Symmetry: C2
Subunit: 44 residues, 2 copies
Amino acid sequence: NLLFQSYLDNVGVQIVRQMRSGERFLKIWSQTVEEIVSYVTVNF
Amino acid sequence: MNLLFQSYLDNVGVQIVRQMRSGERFLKIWSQTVEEIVSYVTVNF
């Protein structure tokens, strides 16, 4: 699924960049989960 | 809902931390994860 795979590749770069700010991984993850659930809402 | 999907993604994040603790770098873990999440949604939705 190219559109979703490319969206998720974008979410990985978002995550890397917030990890480099010193934030705890699971905190970043709980916020980016919302992007993924929203995408699946719209598209599936 | 969709609560089974929320559950699944909560577990993905914990599994990512487990792998980073093992010494794998987030960026190498993530490529595998993207394929897992796309398969989960393709199968379940």
